[PDB]
């Protein structure tokens, strides 16, 4: 190849190897030149493995008030704490029966170095954490819509409706809810148009296009849909409504056999996503009041017109 | 009410656990009533107790060393033997040993005396609650599903059906002893909806139009078959009729289903084994007695463009 | 062969011949170089034998509320122990009759080990139960059906409805009962058609076609069968009918000589292809509200008219 | 036999009309039916051929 390419490959993990062989050599050099010093030895590592019992009390102690947003209780016990935590409770039960100057110090040791937080983590464990983790779908998601679709469709809104405002009436009336309504259910099913979804929803018309130039030859078109949703007895509502192409993408990488993606991730990171796309459009000069998006939960009760009442509610939110 | 009386059975609560905690507590309570020595006779019942998990995985593993290769191929094999929750048995045994070994002997002596004569066996209630908890067993369900409904009213009417395309055009008379319907069966999902693109050596024979109708559930049966053309080396033509199978079909949209969480490695096992049922099932039957032809395969590593034709005629080569 | 398979065969069970040759192996051992040891070995034997006296009696007091709903009173008896239970009774009298601190101990040992459940089932006799039932078809038959049958007719169901119903008001009228009624007696006989098996029950006409092409030479088109069934003296219900065709597999396979599949066991598998069934479909999506499966069990009084009061039960739920 | 796609109109001088014409003359062999022509009216009427 004329272009020497230089690519890093995945770590074997093989640091566990070396440490074995330096425990070994450690236990040959120990044995050449013992119940006692075998009991000391156990008291010691006892004596600094306390140190995650006081971590995770101070996780938990943290952590008590996302325990309703997060996790809804004994969710919250077993997260805050590794595993195999027992471990390090038997070892100290075993130290304690075996024999407090050397407890209590431990104990001030640990917390002080937790305090003062210098075993902090260094560049190779960051890099390994950012490279395993190949399901942090969110953010790049988050990124590749607004940048794709959202800053470049988005200000050419108000000006492409003003037009039909000219003209209709009733679009002139409702002049505060020109925006764009994103839908984001926090689960992943997209319908295909919105009148089934919902009998409360009439299609009215499609917006004028779009036109982008691209070389000349390749145009970019962009299409609009305007619905009109029927209120009680008091008025029509008209909107822009559509839902975001990133839970689509999720939706079908979920059914991927390769994939590896279940359900119960797909949730998390529909979530997390929501929460990225809500932090970088709050932060953008562009679109600053072109947008509102709606997120919300299929209830368990199949009500008819549950999505119908969230759309009036947005809406009736901006007067 | 209800003109009917149905009482269905809901599964069970799991409420045995809470029984077995309220004895411990009794237990523990009567043990407070009316001492640190017969703590180590606990530990050393318990670790007695506790050995006859591991003979019972030293003898699993013995039965099936020789399925090691079949199976597992040495570590996964040591690791299907054995329960994961075993490494606090050799820490009971340890202890037992470092505290005093004619103990030691009598106990393993009874527990393995236990393992020999099969005295400890499930009742009703366990393994019935195991064959209604498996909630994704559909291989046994599936190949009788498909025996039944396609593979016993279809085959049978065989030689007729090829004795009218063989009235069409007679080329297929020299071919006499390959009158038997080919089941492709890949062990993966992968179903060709056309199959002169599998391969560039299918080609159509003869495919006459034909409607399949069922009237409120009940299937109509099948009056013709596809015949296909497999082109050999450079010496002549050999005709076929190929099939899949479609539970197939079912197990690959069981995995596409959003609501089945159905993984790829229980695909596999469950093709496998819907596979050996199948192949099970049709051999000790009576009206499709030599009326088929079962093919099975993985596909390779390597990517080869000529693989499947060639595999049909190795089966055409051998059913000569 | 291009291919070599590689599929597995079944477990020869040759490890009872292990513990027959470690038996001998361990007599012969204990044997070079004894009453009194001989009666503490079969009270060492007796001592862990009662453990299943334990999971008994536990699981009969799990099991005595499902008791009226599985076995309605001595099966729940013989259920929930082992037939080989007067072996341990035999054990712990003869133990008790050459002698009560070992008993209590070897008690609540064993009660802590049913509680805590440590003693569990590797993979190889899972593996072995999974491969040795051979009868359990409920789970596959369900699946099978739904998949091949359900996702691909009850779609096209409401639209297939509306075209007739735009000229026939009796349709109109009646618009909530539009599902497909499946029948799933838990007995296994499937009428030819209903208008025999009830006089209440008439036949109207059939549904028009549902083409699904396949290749452009394929062609599957389906037919549904639309009844009309008499009330009482007030009007007449229109409703799509037809039974379930795993019960007609199940009966098909109960003939067949090979397959050895009795009749007390095909109702248990019916039953359990019914709560799959619904299990299932009460959880998808697609087909939210376009199917109600109905279950009956044929009376002992040969009634004329029981399916048919049954059928307007199920149709007067809706109204 | 791409050329003789046409459609074969048997126009008889007489009146007789075969029931079939497998019978009619033993060198005509029946094969198998054309899939069905499928039109649609008012949405319940199918003339389908």
Same mark, same amino acid.
């Given at each position: 190849?004329?272009?020497?390419?230089?690519?890093?490959?995945?770590?074997?993990?093989?640091?566990?190897?070396?440490?074995?062989?330096?425990?070994?050599?450690?236990?040959?050099?120990?044995?050449?030149?013992?119940?006692?010093?075998?009991?000391?030895?156990?008291?010691?590592?006892?004596?600094?493995?306390?140190?995650?019992?006081?971590?995770?009390?101070?996780?938990?102690?943290?952590?008590?008030?996302?325990?309703?947003?997060?996790?809804?209780?004994?969710?919250?016990?077993?997260?805050?704490?590794?595993?195999?935590?027992?471990?390090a409770?038997?070892?100290?039960?075993?130290?304690?029966?075996?024999?407090?100057?050397? $407890?209590?110090?431990?104990?001030?040791?640990? $917390?002080?170095?937790?305090?003062?937080?210098?075993?902090?983590?260094?560049?190779?464990?960051?890099s390994?954490?950012?490279?395993?983790?190949?399901?942090?779908?969110?953010?790049?998601?988050?990124?590749?819509?607004?940048?794709?679709?959202?800053?470049?469709?988005?200000?050419?809104?108000?000006?492409?409706?003003?037009?039909?405002?000219?003209?209709?009436?009733?679009?002139?009336?409702?002049?505060?809810t020109?925006?764009?309504?994103?839908?984001?259910?926090?689960?992943?099913?997209?319908?295909?148009?919105?009148?089934?979804?919902?009998?409360?929803?009439?299609y009215?018309?499609?917006?004028?296009?779009?036109?982008?130039?691209?070389?000349?030859?390749?145009?970019?078109?962009?299409?609009?849909?305007?619905?009109?949703?029927?209120?009680?007895?008091?008025?029509?509502?008209?909107?822009?409504?559509?839902?975001?192409?990133?839970?689509?993408?999720?939706?079908?990488?979920?059914?991927?056999?390769?994939?590896?993606?279940?359900?119960?991730?797909?949730?998390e990171?529909?979530? $997390?996503?929501?929460?990225?796309?809500?932090?970088?459009?709050?932060?953008?000069?562009?679109?600053?009041?072109?947008?509102?998006?709606?997120?919300?939960?299929?209830?368990?009760?199949?009500?008819?017109?549950?999505?119908?009442?969230?759309?009036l509610?947005? $809406?009736?939110?901006?007067?």
């Open positions: 190849s004329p272009a020497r390419l230089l690519i890093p490959e995945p770590r074997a993990g093989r640091a566990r190897h070396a440490a074995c062989v330096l425990l070994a050599v450690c236990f040959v050099v120990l044995f050449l030149s013992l119940a006692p010093i075998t009991r000391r030895v156990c008291t010691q590592l006892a004596a600094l493995q306390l140190g995650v019992l006081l971590k995770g009390c101070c996780c938990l102690a943290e952590e008590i008030f996302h325990l309703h947003s997060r996790h809804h209780l004994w969710q919250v016990l077993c997260s805050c704490f590794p595993p195999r935590w027992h471990l409770l038997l070892l100290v039960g075993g130290s304690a029966y075996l024999d407090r100057l050397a $407890l209590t110090l431990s104990c001030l040791c640990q $917390l002080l170095v937790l305090a003062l937080g210098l075993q902090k983590l260094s560049a190779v464990e960051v390994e954490l950012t490279e395993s983790s190949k399901k942090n779908v969110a953010h790049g998601l988050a990124w590749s819509y607004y940048i794709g679709y959202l800053k470049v469709v988005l200000p050419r809104l108000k000006e492409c409706m003003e037009e039909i405002s000219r003209t209709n009436p009733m679009l002139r009336a409702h002049r505060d020109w925006k764009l309504h994103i839908l984001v259910p926090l689960g992943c099913d997209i319908w295909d148009d919105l009148e089934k979804a919902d009998s409360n929803i009439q009215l018309a499609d917006l004028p296009e779009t036109i982008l130039t691209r070389a000349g030859i390749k145009r970019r078109v962009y299409k609009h849909s305007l619905y009109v949703i029927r209120d009680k007895d008091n008025k029509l509502r008209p909107c822009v409504l559509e839902f975001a192409s990133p839970l689509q993408t999720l939706c079908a990488m979920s059914q991927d056999d390769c994939a590896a993606f279940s359900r119960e991730q797909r949730l990171q529909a979530r $997390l996503f929501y929460r990225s796309l809500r932090d970088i459009l709050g932060s953008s000069k562009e679109c600053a009041g072109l947008y509102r998006l709606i997120a919300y939960e299929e209830p368990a009760e199949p009500e008819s017109h549950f999505l119908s009442g969230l759309i509610w947005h $809406l009736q939110q901006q007067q």
